[PDB]
């Protein structure tokens with residue numbers, strides 16, 4: 001069904017070993033509520049997803065990305081099941097520990113896992129480790145659920161997805177995993193390219209998550225289908241066209257930045273290529289999933 005795409009996804013070469021490694025660590029430390037929970041956890045294959053998003057990550061770093069994303073999803077699920085206040089408190093306890101300004105309980109996995117993870121990351125590359133720090137707090141604090149809902153125009157919806165705090169985290173993490181060292185200016189001039197990516201990432205997600213999200217809704221599939229009065233299949237076909245169109249915008253922006261007179265850094269190029277993999281990898285994942 002999906003129209004052709006100029007891009008080829010890629011999975012990190014060490015996906016298998018790393019997946020065992022990381023999943024194992026959590027089977028060893030996280031206090032799972034039950035065995036069914038463990039089954040659910042494993043079926044998520046967090047390390048595999050991470051490996052599809054960051055296939056160009058350095059071999060000795062890819063596991064950090066897997067670890068960080070895994071605990072963040074575990075945490076995200078926890079916050080979703082506790083009152084806004086309790087949730088807010090939960091993060092208040094972890095962020096200070098994540099910074100390393102507070103020792104972990106050591107009896108509370110949510111505490112020592114984050115603590116040991118950030119300490120090992122900072123020990124490996126403090127400069128870039130810190131680059132990922134604030135983005136993950138923003139992401140964590142955004143998980144305290146309240147309000148949120150009702151967007152009916154395409155524009156507003158796409159604009160809202162461009163600002164997604166998680167896709168922002170992904171990009172920061174991507175830099176750390178690949179060991180990319182960019183300048184403030186370089187990073188700023190990447191905004192547009194980044195927004196286009198965050199937007200593409202969301203729509204492809206919606207297209208594949210629409211059906212399952214049916215039971216009783218912030219989705220591009222719903223928004224457009226209403227505005228255009230088309231059926232779901234048609235809407236999806238249209239969303240795909242737009243998706244492939246945005247991939248061209250990506251390529252166009254890249255080519256332009258590279259061929260630019262002011263030149264394009266080696267680290268900059270790696271960064272842009274990296275974003276392409278998040279998108280190609282995100283789709284690959286989205287097809288074959290759940």
Ligand SMILES: CC(C)=CCC/C(C)=C/CC/C(C)=C/CO
Pocket residue numbers: 161166167170201202203205206
């Ligand atoms: C962005 C994060 C935290 C993980 C990768 C998988 C993913 C995109 C999950 C949520 C789906 C979503 C909100 C898509 C945007 O429409």
